[PDB]
């Protein structure tokens, strides 16, 4: 018995025979279900229960120590089977989790041990976060519930009719007419009900109505408010996540005022920037601690024809580059002989190289099968598809190409970490699709009358298709939209689906590539005056100055301002003097460092552009002719060398000039691994998102429309969509869409729904073109767009240890150990004395621990009091608030009261107590002014009330983890602010020539009369938006349009309405490649590093802590 349990438990057979079951069973379970895969599910249950009953009676169950119980792994089994018994013998919801069996195949793969054990190391080490996340996301939660609490139900209401329709005026009458939903105003065809309100920049009402509050839902079927702590909390977390959030984003503005900005700039600057920069950090530092464990375990040969076929290889490209749709004839015709000829090129090169180069030889090496396999697909395309691989033929370029040649090589020498990396994530995306079919499934189907129309949404849980794709979308970070529609027709379980769904797979997996990618790839007297002056600090001072103010003159320049002519007068003056400054400046620059130092520097080259550009508009405006705003424009680059010397500045600045060569490769490769989709794309869908449409730009059934003859036949339109494939440029821009996804969920509906030329599409009856995406996705964004963060690690890593004086030669723990020694440098005791016998038993009872026990309890107490706050509560329970929180307030002052007697004078030695001592001070003013405040605006009693959030602030004094990751934080602040007093000047840049540029036109997509380039606040508005990414396919819709736009007038003065597509992409691709992709990362960098060096201070040297703790005895 015990020898045949144990010898067959030890046979590789039995193991492959059970993974070969386990996979099987995974096939069956993507199928429908049938009486088949029922009698299967018997059969594979019973399989299940042999390999149980082997393993016990080898080992035993739980009572020694190598037991069959004492392994996680075996646990996994021993549950699944027994909820397949329960399933069996006897809820539907439990037997979803049968699939988490298939988690075993993880170790088909070679190396999975080091990635598993990431995974689970980065897991542990996530406890000192999550308590941290929990409390930060909580004091959001309760500042954001006392600033926009009821502000999303405000809604337009018609007057109350004064011709007597609906009768002579009462209260409730008036009531009953505004209460009806039918006299609030919505746009015809709109799903939501615009918000408004009355403070200044907020939304406006159309004449006839005013904005009211109380009346009908919150946005998005109602989950989407601050009305309670629980819909905040989800609010707070979505808007950390960045997931949809410029849509919160611009209802809290319209609803409340353009100021509300400031909040949203605080939660996305130590929530994004900083919080999941930390979670990136710990990820990190699991999967190198796991590396290095493992790690430490243990005519025809000659130059001239290659150079032949280097440029006939550019030329092929660039054939293939060139094919579009709706091609004339000469087109295909040169394009086809092209491709004869450079076939003809490659055969007669194999046959010359076999002649040559032995044949043994010649198949010996590997590029020379890669062009013999390229020069027989050629071979049977032309034959007689087959033209998709063409595209191999790109790839020969990375031969002659040292760049790509070594991305390649880096590519291949550490593959099998990448693959068990992918193993991973899809294995996850199988289980949670599999769990959530099994969980939604029946609910869309069931419920379908809740949604809009009835009508089946495009992303549900319906096949395993769909519910695959819906959960990968969640993992590219999009899932608020799904768990509405889950929400919808299901139940609360929705939420903790989605959520897991999405921290597991983004915050973790995908963080994880990143750290993969991150360990791999990485007259005298003249001359004498105009010198001192240079050189003196009141010029440079005064310089300074005088761009400071004058760049900030810039932003007055908005729409209004030829209605303000003392403006127009001031502004053309101080161009006057500035040109007359620009020159003497330049005169005395040139007298004082001389013409080959002015000439041989960056600086004094932009300085020298502007002069130039002052004085062709001078000459412009002798001659009679109006300036170029865009050269006068030009004097804000000015900026930059003063903000260049602010302190601590040199260390930023420093580290992107010299990543600057590396972002210009990484963008190179990017361009060619694109160029081979949108090669691939415009052959896939090239003419075949044409659509029929009637007056309202809706989509005709195939039905009665077969094709395009009788879609003019009935006199609709034939249209295409705005963003297409019709040629490699089109695809270009689609797949940018696509790689941010930003717009991509209507380039896949188009894609998905695509037939032949000249058909009408149907839904989804190209359903597998999901696939196209899928990888581009993961070769172009989940790879690609994240080197720059990876180089910008490794620059800031080097740069900062030039900033501190280090040498780059010293290793890890040498500088550990020199850390240390600076520290032990620097200490110093102190003691109070304890008082008088009174006061003195009053120091015991303050000094005692129990004491600081009882305040954090009686903090979380008074926090839980404000967690309870409501929208629409009775005035009793407002009153039953106030007075527990005045209770509270009593015993806080009676605490600091009480040090204050203990302590005497030491008291305000220790910084937190001097926190305590503002904040009882506070409590007690506001506790005495709240109703002379309220009843002598409701905005500045929320804000001002705001202070009360103060006392549950201490919260956090006492604890040890997040002590260490706020000491890393306060670290690395300096750093934080000068990255963004950097974003800011950019975005500034940008705002004066958004504003220039894009001030006229017409409110389409997302530019509408509140969110628009009319001022300076609102360019700002729209461009911190941007600088997420957020919402720039609908800015980009809006302002590349040049269709039904009427142009404009010089002699009416009508400055006209119409779009620019050229300046369009080029502002928003250069924003998008200057903030998202490079400086936002900086702050990813900057964290990174600290955190580090304050966890290896921690673990292989010494803390601050460590030192405390010996001078306490001392
Ligand atoms: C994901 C990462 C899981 C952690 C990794 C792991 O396997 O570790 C635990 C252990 C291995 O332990 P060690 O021995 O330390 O590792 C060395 C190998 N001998 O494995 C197990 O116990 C396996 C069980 C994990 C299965 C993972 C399943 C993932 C899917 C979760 C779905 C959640 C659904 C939630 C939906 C809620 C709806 C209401
Ligand atoms: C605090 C800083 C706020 C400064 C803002 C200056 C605003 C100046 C101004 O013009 O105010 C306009 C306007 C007043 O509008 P009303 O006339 O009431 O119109 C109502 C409808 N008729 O002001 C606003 O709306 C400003 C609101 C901005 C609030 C943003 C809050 C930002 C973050 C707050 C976090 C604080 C947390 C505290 C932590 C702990 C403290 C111990
Ligand atoms: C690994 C990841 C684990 C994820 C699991 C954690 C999520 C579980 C949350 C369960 C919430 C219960 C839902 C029921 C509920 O009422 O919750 C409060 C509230 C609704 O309150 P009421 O106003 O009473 O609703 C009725 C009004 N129409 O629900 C929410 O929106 C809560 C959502 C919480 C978001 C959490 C996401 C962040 C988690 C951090 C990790
Ligand atoms: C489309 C309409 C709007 C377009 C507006 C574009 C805005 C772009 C803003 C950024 C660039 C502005 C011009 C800067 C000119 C640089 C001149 C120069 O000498 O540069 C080197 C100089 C070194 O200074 P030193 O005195 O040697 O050292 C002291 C450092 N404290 O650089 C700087 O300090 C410049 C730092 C600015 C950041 C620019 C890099 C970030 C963007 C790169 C991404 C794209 C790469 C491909
Ligand atoms: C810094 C980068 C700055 C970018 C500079 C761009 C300059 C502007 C050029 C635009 C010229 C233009 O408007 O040409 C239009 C012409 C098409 O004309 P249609 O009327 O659509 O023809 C009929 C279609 N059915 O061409 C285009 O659409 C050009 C599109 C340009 C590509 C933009 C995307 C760039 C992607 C960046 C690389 C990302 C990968 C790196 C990582
Ligand atoms: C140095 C870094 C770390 C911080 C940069 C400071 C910003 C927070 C400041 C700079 C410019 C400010 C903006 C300047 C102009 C406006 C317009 C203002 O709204 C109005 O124009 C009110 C009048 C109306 O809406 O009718 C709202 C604040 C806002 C967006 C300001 C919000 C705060 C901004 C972004
Ligand atoms: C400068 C002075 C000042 C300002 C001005 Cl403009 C005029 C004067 Cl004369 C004085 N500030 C200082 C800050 C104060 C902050 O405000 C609060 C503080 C609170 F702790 C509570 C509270 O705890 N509420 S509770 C019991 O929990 O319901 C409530 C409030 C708000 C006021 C209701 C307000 C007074
Ligand atoms: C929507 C609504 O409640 N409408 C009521 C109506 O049912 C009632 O008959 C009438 C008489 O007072 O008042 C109003
Ligand atoms: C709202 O007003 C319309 C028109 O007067 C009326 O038909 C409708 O019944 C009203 N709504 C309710 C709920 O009575
Ligand atoms: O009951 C309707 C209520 O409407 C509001 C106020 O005018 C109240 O005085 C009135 O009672």
């Not at 353009?258 to 929530?271: E, K, S, T």
């Not at 007669?348 to 010996?364: G, Q």
């Not at 190179?668 to 090669?679: D, E, K, M, Y």
Request: aromatic residues 16%; contains cysteine; hydrophobic residues 50%.
């Amino acid at each position: 018995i015990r020898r045949v349990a144990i010898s067959t438990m030890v046979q590789p057979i039995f193991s492959y025979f059970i993974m070969i079951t386990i996979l099987i069973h995974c096939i069956f379970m993507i199928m429908p279900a049938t009486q088949t895969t029922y009698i299967l599910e018997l059969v594979f249950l019973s399989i299940y229960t042999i390999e149980v009953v082997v393993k016990v009676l080898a080992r035993g169950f739980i009572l020694h120590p190598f037991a069959y119980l004492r392994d996680p792994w075996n646990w996994l089994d021993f549950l699944v089977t027994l909820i397949g018994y329960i399933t069996l013998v006897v809820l539907y919801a439990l037997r979803a989790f049968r699939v988490l069996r298939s988690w075993r195949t993880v170790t088909i793969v070679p190396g999975w041990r080091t990635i598993v054990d990431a995974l689970s190391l980065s897991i542990t080490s996530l406890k000192d976060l999550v308590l941290l996340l929990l409390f930060s996301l909580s004091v959001f939660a309760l500042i954001g519930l006392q600033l926009f609490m009821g502000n999303l139900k405000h809604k337009c209401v018609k007057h109350f009719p004064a011709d007597g329709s609906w009768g002579n005026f009462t209260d409730e009458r008036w009531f009953n007419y505004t209460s009806n939903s039918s006299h609030w105003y919505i746009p015809d065809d709109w799903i939501e009900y615009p918000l408004c309100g009355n403070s200044s920049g907020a939304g406006m009402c159309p004449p006839g109505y005013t904005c009211l509050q109380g009346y009908g839902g919150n946005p998005n079927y109602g989950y989407t408010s601050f009305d309670t702590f629980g819909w905040a909390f989800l609010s707070v977390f979505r808007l950390v996540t960045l997931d949809y959030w410029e849509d919160l984003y611009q209802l809290a503005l319209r609803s409340a005022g353009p100021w509300h900005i400031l909040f949203f700039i605080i939660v996305v600057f130590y929530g994004t920037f900083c919080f999941l920069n930390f979670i990136l950090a710990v990820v990190v530092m699991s999967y190198t601690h796991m590396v290095k464990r493992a790690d430490e375990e243990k005519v025809v040969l000659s130059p001239f024809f290659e150079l032949f076929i280097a440029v006939i290889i550019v030329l092929n490209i660039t054939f293939m580059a060139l094919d579009h749709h709706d091609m004339n004839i000469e087109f295909e015709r040169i394009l086809r002989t092209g491709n004869y000829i450079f076939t003809s090129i490659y055969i007669v090169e194999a046959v010359l190289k076999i002649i040559a180069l032995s044949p043994k030889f010649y198949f010996k090496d590997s590029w020379n099968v890669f062009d013999f396999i390229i020069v027989v697909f050629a071979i049977l395309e032309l034959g007689l598809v087959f033209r998709s691989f063409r595209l191999l033929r790109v790839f020969r370029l990375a031969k002659f190409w040292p760049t790509l040649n070594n991305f390649m090589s880096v590519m291949t020498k550490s593959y099998g970490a990448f693959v068990n990396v992918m193993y991973v994530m899809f294995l996850l995306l199988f289980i949670f699709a599999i769990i959530g079919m099994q969980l939604f499934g029946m609910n869309y189907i069931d419920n379908m009358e809740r949604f809009p129309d009835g009508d089946l949404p495009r992303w549900n849980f319906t096949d395993f298709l769909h519910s695959f794709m819906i959960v990968f979308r969640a993992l590219c970070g999009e899932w608020i939209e799904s768990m509405w529609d889950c929400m919808l027709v299901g139940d609360w379980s929705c939420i903790p689906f989605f959520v897991a769904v999405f921290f597991v797979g983004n915050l973790v997996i995908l963080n994880l590539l990143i750290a993969l990618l991150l360990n791999n790839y990485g007259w005298s007297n003249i001359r004498r005056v105009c010198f001192l002056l240079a050189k003196n600090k009141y010029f440079q001072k005064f310089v300074t100055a005088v761009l400071v103010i004058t760049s900030v003159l810039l932003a007055l320049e908005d729409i209004y301002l030829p209605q303000r002519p003392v403006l127009v007068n001031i502004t053309l003056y101080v161009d006057y003097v500035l040109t007359a400054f620009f020159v003497i400046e330049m005169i005395i620059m040139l007298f004082a460092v001389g013409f080959k130092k002015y000439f041989t520097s960056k600086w004094y080259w932009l300085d020298f552009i502007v002069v130039v550009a002052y004085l062709l508009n001078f000459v412009l405006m002798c001659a009679g002719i109006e300036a170029l705003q865009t050269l006068r424009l030009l004097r804000v680059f000015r900026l930059f060398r003063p903000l260049s010397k602010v302190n601590g500045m040199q260390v930023v600045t420093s580290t992107l000039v010299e990543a600057v060569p590396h972002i210009f490769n990484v963008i190179l490769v990017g361009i060619f691994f694109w160029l081979v989709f949108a090669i691939m794309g415009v052959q896939l869908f090239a003419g075949k998102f044409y659509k029929c449409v009637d007056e309202n730009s809706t989509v005709l059934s195939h039905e009665i429309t077969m094709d395009r003859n009788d879609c003019l036949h009935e006199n609709y339109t034939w249209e295409n969509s705005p963003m297409n494939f019709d040629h490699v440029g089109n695809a270009y821009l689609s797949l940018l869409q696509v790689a941010t996804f930003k717009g991509w969920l209507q380039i896949m509906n188009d894609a998905i729904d695509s037939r032949e030329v000249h058909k009408q599409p149907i839904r989804e009856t190209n359903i597998y073109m999901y696939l196209y995406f899928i990888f581009f996705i993961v070769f172009g964004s989940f790879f690609i767009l994240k080197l720059f963060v990876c180089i910008l690690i490794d620059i800031f890593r080097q740069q900062r240890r030039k900033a501190e004086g280090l040498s780059a030669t010293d290793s890890r723990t040498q500088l550990i150990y020199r850390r240390a020694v600076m520290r032990t440098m620097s200490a110093k005791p102190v003691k109070r004395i304890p008082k008088n016998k009174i006061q003195g038993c009053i120091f015991d009872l303050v000094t005692n621990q129990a004491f600081d026990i009882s305040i954090m309890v009686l903090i979380c107490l008074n926090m839980v009091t404000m967690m309870v706050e409501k929208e629409g509560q009775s005035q009793h329970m407002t009153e039953v608030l106030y007075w527990i929180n005045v209770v509270f307030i009593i015993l806080f002052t009676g605490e600091c009261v009480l040090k204050l007697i203990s302590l005497r004078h030491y008291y305000f030695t220790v910084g937190w107590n001097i926190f305590d001592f503002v904040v009882v001070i506070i409590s007690i003013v506001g506790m005495f002014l709240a109703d002379l405040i309220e009843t002598y605006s409701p905005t500045l009693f929320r804000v001002i009330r705001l202070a009360r959030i103060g006392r549950i602030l201490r919260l956090v004094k006492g604890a040890k983890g997040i002590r260490l990751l706020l000491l890393a934080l306060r670290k690395a602040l300096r750093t934080l602010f000068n990255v963004s007093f950097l974003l800011f000047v950019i975005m500034f840049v940008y705002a004066v020539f958004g504003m220039e540029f894009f001030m006229h036109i017409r409110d389409a997509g997302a530019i509408d009369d509140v969110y628009n380039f009319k001022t300076f606040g609102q360019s700002i508005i729209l461009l911190f938006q941007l600088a997420t990414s957020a919402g720039w396919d609908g800015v980009y819709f809006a302002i590349a349009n040049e269709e039904d736009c009427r142009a404009p007038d010089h002699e009416l003065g009508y400055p006209g309405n119409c779009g620019s597509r050229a300046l369009g992409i080029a502002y928003l691709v250069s924003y998008l490649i200057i903030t998202c992709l490079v400086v936002i990362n900086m702050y990813a960098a900057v964290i990174l590093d600290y955190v580090l060096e304050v966890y290896e201070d921690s673990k292989e040297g010494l803390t601050d802590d460590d030192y405390d703790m010996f001078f306490e005895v001392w």
